[PDB]
Amino acid sequence: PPIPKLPGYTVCLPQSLSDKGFKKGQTLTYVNGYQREDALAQV
């Protein structure tokens, strides 16, 4: 069951033939400000 990390060993399932969906979340975003803006990193 353990398998090496070498190139080409693992073939991932396409996951798009299934209805999964790949919405990406804004975990990095700026904070409302004028000239000065602060970056925010969340969990």
Binding site: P14, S16, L17, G21, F22, K23, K24, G25, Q26, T29, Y30, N32
Partner: protein, 427 residues
């Protein structure tokens, strides 16, 4: 990374009427306005559990607007996001550009300013209008002019609906279209044409709908917009944002007119019947029987191409396809661009609307190219402007509204310079 979409006129807000239905269906938002964070590019989250779109439907006739206010999406759209005049513009560019604009546009741009202030990572604007109307053309041009002086450097993706060569629902629309273009030159950053005749052709050929209404047109145009904004919304193996088309497709500051296409537009029968791979849909995206603008790119030479991909696409086959297309000679580029493509890949497959006529396909392609057949379109359009204006027809209405007669002369010579541009640039 948020993009706000403004809709001008009868066609504009009817395309957005289908587009926003697609958006709510893609992000799982109820027509109430709450889910049962990728939505953040379209829906602002107000208070607690309430999503209000980033758009402005503006028009002069209150009919279709308050129809929206009374329809299914009463609660979704913000009460004041829908802006509506009192009297129509009536297919009259001057009437919609000088008489009615001077009171509606200052309220509109004041509104859009506080939408941009609520925004955080504004990517750009994307506008929806038809140049046949007086509302879409007149104050559409006035709004774009005052937007360019307001922000300027941010992109304004314009998805316009130009009049068809023979299928037409107006008489003065050559006058309107020419006078709208004369300002769409130096204001719009990237302008995409959409002819209703070519979409009628596609609805007949592929979806085999013998009697389509405007809704099927609006529905598949929404599919196209969703397919070229999917990179912003969902993550892909090779994503490409809004401000990219500005750099990859416009080789000259006055040559920005893009022939859109899409593939696969397919019915529920032929989808079950045909194997849909990346090779044939890359071919099918180039066949002029599947373009959204009635022209013949074989009659011209391509300038630059952009290929948005959705669904199950691994890079090997899209690159192998681009290779095949480069080896074929039924299509040929201009002698400038040895790197004539812009590939883009997104993971998510296109969604279906219950009641729509498109089948669910695992993959899709949206091609936004540039050629000289658009220079053929403007020549045909300028001929039937030349016919009517030689006899001073209909000029009385425009002069009464307030346009000086010269506007006509300089708009005609501006198109003439545009013909020279395509003729020399293609050399």
């Amino acid at each position: 990374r948020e993009v706000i979409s403004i809709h001008i006129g009868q066609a504009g807000i009817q395309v957005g009427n289908a587009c926003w239905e697609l958006y709510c269906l893609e992000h799982g938002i109820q027509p109430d306005g709450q889910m049962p964070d990728a939505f953040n590019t379209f829906f602002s989250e107000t208070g607690a559990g309430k999503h209000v779109p980033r758009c402005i439907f503006l028009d002069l006739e209150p009919t279709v607007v308050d129809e929206v206010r009374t329809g299914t999406y009463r609660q979704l759209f913000h009460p004041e996001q829908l802006i509506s005049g009192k009297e129509d513009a009536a297919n009259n560019f001057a009437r919609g550009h000088y008489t009615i604009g001077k009171e509606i546009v200052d309220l509109a741009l004041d509104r859009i300013r506080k939408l941009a202030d609520n925004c955080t990572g504004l990517q750009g604007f994307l506008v929806f209008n038809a140049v046949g109307g007086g509302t879409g053309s007149g104050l559409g041009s006035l709004l774009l002019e005052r937007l360019s002086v307001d922000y300027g450097k941010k992109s304004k993706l314009g998805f316009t609906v130009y009049p068809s060569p023979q299928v037409s629902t107006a008489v003065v629309e050559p006058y309107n279209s020419v006078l709208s273009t004369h300002s769409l030159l130096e204001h719009t950053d990237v302008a995409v044409m959409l002819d209703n005749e070519a979409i009628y052709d596609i609805c007949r050929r592929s979806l085999d709908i013998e009697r389509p209404t405007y809704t099927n047109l609006n529905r598949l145009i929404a599919q196209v917009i969703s397919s070229l904004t999917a990179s912003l919304r969902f993550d892909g193996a090779l994503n490409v944002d809004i401000t990219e088309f500005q750099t990859n497709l416009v080789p000259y500051p006055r040559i920005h007119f893009m022939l859109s296409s899409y593939a696969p537009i397919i019915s529920a029968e032929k989808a079950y019947h045909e194997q849909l791979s990346v090779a044939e849909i890359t071919n099918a995206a180039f066949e002029p029987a599947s373009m959204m603008v009635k022209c013949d790119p074989r009659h011209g030479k391509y300038m630059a191409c952009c290929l948005m991909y959705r669904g199950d696409v691994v890079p090997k086959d899209v690159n192998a396809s681009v290779a095949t297309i480069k080896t074929k000679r039924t299509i040929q580029f201009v002698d400038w661009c040895p790197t004539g493509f812009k590939c883009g890949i997104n993971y998510q497959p296109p969604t279906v609307v219950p009641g729509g006529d498109l089948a669910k396909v695992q993959r899709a392609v949206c091609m936004i190219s540039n050629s000289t057949a658009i220079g053929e379109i403007f020549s045909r359009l300028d001929h039937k402007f030349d016919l009517m204006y030689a006899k001073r027809a209909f000029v009385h209405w425009y002069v009464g509204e307030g346009m000086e007669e010269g506007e006509f002369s300089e708009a005609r010579e501006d198109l003439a310079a545009l013909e020279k541009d395509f003729e020399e640039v293609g050399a």
